[PDB]
Write a protein that binds this ligand. Structure first.
Ligand SMILES: CCCCCCCCCCCCCCCCCC(=O)OC[C@H](CO[C@@H]1O[C@H](CO)[C@H](O)[C@H](O)[C@H]1O)OC(=O)CCCCCCCCCCCCCCCCC
Ligand SMILES: CCCCCCCCCCCCCCCCCC(=O)OC[C@H](CO)OC(=O)CCCCCCCCCCCCCCCCC
Ligand SMILES: CC(C)CCC[C@@H](C)[C@H]1CC[C@H]2[C@@H]3CC=C4C[C@@H](OC(=O)CCC(=O)O)CC[C@]4(C)[C@H]3CC[C@]12C
Lengths: 318, 38, 44, 24, 59, 51
């Protein structure tokens, strides 16, 4: 019940096509975030930099989605859609679209939001559904990736499963307009619902990498996906590292910025540890070095100030 | 009992001096003697 | 007058317990070091 | 191949006893 | 090399010196940082007199 | 005398336990560690590294 060249080549072409689309659209929405939030949506409440930085996160995450599809390109080229772990990847890719569309029913920001989202989500639904019907007839870096998947899981499971937050009132804030002492709105809600999907994409990328290269197929050429998991990350962090200068309020709402900051930090430290290969036993050598030093210190202290070592120990020969 | 019957300073110093004079200096000049052989 | 105080630890018995051990052990170290100077650092 | 037991701790010196009165 | 770097600040350089001197006079930071409370055996007067003696060169 | 001989041939494990093992390798190290950690302030050099 193997997979001949037919389904393999069809899946490969599907993957490369949709992934190129996601990649170029990610670059486009990056420059659009650099332009403004009125680039794609119609909510008139979009005169704030927080929409801009949220959209920068959107950009980096769609870059990550491109990386995911290039990963599946490189993986299924050897017809590796037979092991149950690729079935896990595909079913979770389907769950991406599942949660996305059911939450779109639970809320929508602008027509183009559902446009792009349902576009590529229906692409995923069709491919995974029909190919899974066909298949029916057939350490340290690990710690970082595990915490990444669980932090992003928490970010989603908390953000969407509840309706929405309410901004601080700040009683007495210019009783006129300028939204001071007011509630929230379409722009905010939907732009945010996006960011959640971006962190979902990188969540799925990371769960795939963990459950696949937890024996760290071939462990190395994942170097492709690695770039897609690092590059985006650092650039994301960049924007965040200047969000205070941009005059944004990132601190009042933990349910959104927390996962973004934590995932950026985790991806950056993952890149760093992959550059020098902390072997999960080198920390043992570090702690042993510091303990040896402090042992050498307390021995000198004891022999100099408390009780000589030639006194307390026994002497031989008489 | 086993503390106050250890060798005092005299015997410890004698041991150290004996090792310095006989554990290195004796065998070394022994080697020299065989290389060169009252 | 700028009146200033210290830190004042609240334990009193865990604070003074490693300094009291030193107050009792250091005299022997001083005596041994002095006589060592005399009878070995000179009479090598 | 060993058991789960302490080691003797007083075959070298006698200083350890100094903690039993003091703590007491 | 350090002369210009020290002449630059001229305010932190006279804040850290003040803190360091007042902290070595009464060794009261010692318990929380090392565990041995050195303030019980330390004599601030003898240190102050040492300081002033070497400042005036009068043993 | 006969009773002592009989009892000594049946009690070798307990004799060694009470003579060589009870204090030196069971009670003394426990007491020593608990007593050290009773004194000795809540530092790290003192709680873990120096012991
Ligand atoms: C840098 C700061 C350190 C300066 C170096 C100190 C030199 C060590 C020698 C004396 C210190 C001994 C000490 O800590 O025990 C503490 C000593 C002795 O402590 C006293 O001991 C007496 C003996 O019976 C009594 O017990 C007193 O109770 C006890 O206070 O006291 C002092 O040192 C108090 C401060 C005096 C400081 C004088 C200036 C330091 C000497 C010049 C050093 C030049 C350095 C440049
Ligand atoms: C003879 C022995 C009869 C008394 C038994 C010890 C008292 C235990 C109760 C301590 C307590 O109330 O428990 C509470 C106490 C803390 O409040 O626990 C602790 O941390 C106590 C830790 C200190 C350990 C004490 C060790 C000294 C024991 C004396 C040995 C000298 C005997 C040698 C011969
Ligand atoms: C005197 C009264 C108050 C208590 C009696 C204490 C002893 C009878 C116990 C306490 C500690 C015990 C020891 C603690 C640890 C171990 C390791 C453990 O080794 C095994 O797994 C042996 C079993 C096997 O594989 O044969 C159990 C036996 C032994 C030596 C124990 C033997 C019996 C000891 C000395």
């Amino acid at each position: 019940p193997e997979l001949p060249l037919s389904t393999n080549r069809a899946a490969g072409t599907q993957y490369l096509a949709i992934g190129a689309a996601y990649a170029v659209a990610a670059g486009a929405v990056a420059v659009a975030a650099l332009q403004g939030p009125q680039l794609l949506l119609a909510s008139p409440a979009a005169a704030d930099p927080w929409s801009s930085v949220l959209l920068g996160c959107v950009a980096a995450t769609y870059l990550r989605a491109a990386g995911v599809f290039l990963q599946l390109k490189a993986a299924s080229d050897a017809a590796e859609l037979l092991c149950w772990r690729h079935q896990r990847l595909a079913l979770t890719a389907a769950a991406y679209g599942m949660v996305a569309v059911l939450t779109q029913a639970a809320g929508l920001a602008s027509p183009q939001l559902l446009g792009l989202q349902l576009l590529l989500s229906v692409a995923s639904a069709a491919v995974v559904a029909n190919v899974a019907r066909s298949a029916w007839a057939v350490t340290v870096a690990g710690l970082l990736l595990t915490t990444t998947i669980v932090v992003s899981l928490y970010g989603l499971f908390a953000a969407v499963f509840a309706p929405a937050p309410a901004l601080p009132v700040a009683v007495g804030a210019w009783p006129g307009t300028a939204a001071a002492a007011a509630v929230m709105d379409g722009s905010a809600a939907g732009l945010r619902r996006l960011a959640a999907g971006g962190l979902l994409l990188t969540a799925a990328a990371s769960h795939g990498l963990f459950d696949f290269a937890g024996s760290v197929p071939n462990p190395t050429i994942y170097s492709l996906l690695n770039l897609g998991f690092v590059a985006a990350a650092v650039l994301q962090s960049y924007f965040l590292y200047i969000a205070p200068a941009w005059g944004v309020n990132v601190n009042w709402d933990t349910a959104l910025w927390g996962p973004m900051y934590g995932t950026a930090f985790l991806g950056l430290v993952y890149g760093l540890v992959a550059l020098t290969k902390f072997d999960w036993s080198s920390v043992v050598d570090a702690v042993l070095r510091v303990a040896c030093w402090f042992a050498e210190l307390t021995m000198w202290f004891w022999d100099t100030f408390v009780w000589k070592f030639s006194w307390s120990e026994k002497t031989r020969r008489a | 009992f086993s503390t106050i019957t250890q060798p005092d300073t005299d015997l410890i110093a004698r041991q150290e001096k004996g090792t310095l004079f006989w554990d290195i200096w004796a065998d070394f000049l022994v080697t020299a003697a065989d290389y060169y052989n009252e | 007058v700028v009146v200033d105080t210290g830190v004042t630890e609240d334990d009193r018995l865990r604070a003074s317990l490693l300094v009291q051990m030193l107050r009792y052990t250091v005299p022997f170290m001083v005596i041994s070091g002095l006589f060592w100077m005399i009878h070995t650092w000179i009479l090598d | 191949s060993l058991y789960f037991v302490f080691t003797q701790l007083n075959q070298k010196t006698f200083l350890s006893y100094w903690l039993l009165p003091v703590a007491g | 090399k350090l002369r210009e770097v020290l002449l630059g600040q001229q305010e932190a350089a006279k804040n850290v010196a003040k803190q360091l001197d007042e902290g070595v006079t009464y060794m009261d930071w010692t318990y929380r940082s090392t565990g041995v409370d050195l303030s019980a055996v330390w004599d601030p007067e003898l240190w102050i007199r040492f300081r002033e003696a070497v400042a005036q060169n009068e043993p | 005398g006969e009773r002592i001989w009989a009892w000594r041939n049946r009690s070798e494990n307990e004799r060694w336990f009470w003579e060589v093992f009870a204090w030196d390798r069971l009670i003394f190290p426990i007491l020593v560690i608990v007593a050290w950690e009773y004194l000795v302030p809540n530092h790290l050099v003192w709680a873990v590294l120096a012991p």
